[PDB]
Curated annotation (Swiss-Prot), chains A, B:
It comes from Turnip yellows virus (isolate FL-1). This is Minor capsid readthrough protein. The record marks K214, T215 as: Cleavage. It is found in: Virion; Host cell junction, Host plasmodesma; Host periplasm. Minor component of the viral capsid involved in aphid transmission and virus accumulation in the host. Required for the virus to move through the aphid. The RTD domain of the protein is exposed on the surface of the particle and determines the vector specificity and intestinal tropism in the aphid. The lineage of its organism: Viruses, Riboviria, Orthornavirae, Pisuviricota, Pisoniviricetes. The chain holds residues 224 to 459 of 670 of the full protein.
Length: 236, 236
């Protein structure tokens, strides 16, 4: 009779290696990601498993594994994709030194799939992008080969668990490794950077019936028209 | 007795004039701001009034006026300041051409004040920043004089209406006009740009007792420790 309502919010990050704006970047294995878990107005931190869904020498797709308690759920997710790169060395430790851009393939974007013991139905995955002006230059590099500064997602789906240890995964747009997407400031030596993946907010509303209201965020402006799909992503 | 819970969310924008990154910018009068109003899972668009709270030769502080229904309210606001610039014309209207940077003055950040027929108590206006790296270059200019890309706020207060048609206002960090903060792409002529002010999310919780789900805004990557401002802003 009383329906559960669970929220996860987090800003996943990962470590990269970058030399010059003319060089491809390398990627560390993804770390576990600190998310805030909220249910019944008790609040705690949790680490969500994350890894590369796929990786090759051109790109890697990030994935985050989200546990689902047994039940039937309406799942609502917002994702604000932006990859600023930042130094790890003083006195410039937390200062943004550039970004890694996305491509403009909205079919390779924010979506969900089955990780364990869930069925995902009635999906609607929306994806948008933000381009750069043809004269804009960041660290000596232009944005005229499809490079996008931001890739946003808005997703709603229906998730039914089929046992214990149930989870779905969220994939993001690909982390591009080729040099045309690398706008991290150039150094003469390979230099580690921290790279944000984006802001992710997840709500699990049991049978869409908890009635729970919360504060919200607006959709970013300047973004393209959305490409939408009902398809989900298959586990590789 | 039903305790109301009201949310406003929007990304205010305003029009500027900019020529080359070596020139200062000019600020037009602020327009009305499109916000979403959310109460009892019922959503509508509304235009909030905005204007420059103050302006001197170097900078201007924006203000946005927020209606408050009769009663007593606990107020929670999150603000994510980022000022990307873009053309007002075709093509490129949706393409980011650059940004206007902030200074690192955390004594001048997001805050609230009385607009009409409210008393504001228990104000705590927290402010953070994110620097650009001195070596980063955007549109021919470096971040080597303390320029900040982002200025975020987290505010709580208590608002009690003391008359009809009550409202408070939100101020933001200073919009800097000097050339060293101008990273909008260079044009040969003075050219109008749209400039975002930032993401604002306001929650009004009647007597703090609606039972809304309390989340917390994820602290964006690389932001400074918060500096608190206690006094509210006074109208001239």
């Amino acid at each position: 009779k009383k329906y559960r309502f669970i929220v996860y919010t987090g800003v996943p990050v990962t470590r990269i290696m970058a030399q010059s704006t003319d060089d491809a970047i390398s990627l560390y294995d993804m770390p576990s990601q600190r998310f805030r878990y909220i249910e019944d107005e008790n609040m705690n931190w949790t680490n969500l498993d994350s890894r590369w869904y796929s990786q090759n020498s051109l790109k890697a797709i990030p994935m985050i594994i989200v546990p689902v308690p047994q039940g039937e759920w309406t799942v609502e997710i917002s994702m604000e994709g932006y990859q600023p790169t930042s130094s790890t060395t003083d006195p410039n430790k937390d200062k943004q030194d550039g970004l890694i851009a996305y491509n403009d393939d909205l079919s390779e974007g924010w979506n969900v799939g089955i990780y364990n013991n869930v069925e995902i139905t009635n999906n609607k995955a929306d994806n948008t992008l933000k381009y750069g002006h043809p004269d804009m230059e960041l660290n000596g590099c232009h944005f005229n080969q499809g490079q996008c500064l931001e890739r946003d997602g808005d997703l709603t789906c229906h998730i039914k668990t089929t046992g214990d240890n149930a989870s779905f995964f969220v994939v993001g747009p690909a982390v591009q490794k080729q040099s045309k997407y690398n706008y991290a400031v150039s150094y003469g030596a390979w230099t580690d950077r921290m790279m944000e993946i984006g802001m992710i907010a997840i709500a699990l509303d049991e049978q869409g019936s908890s009635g729970s209201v919360k504060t919200e965020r607006p959709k970013r402006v300047g973004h393209s028209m959305a490409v939408s799909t009902w398809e989900t992503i298959k586990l590789p």
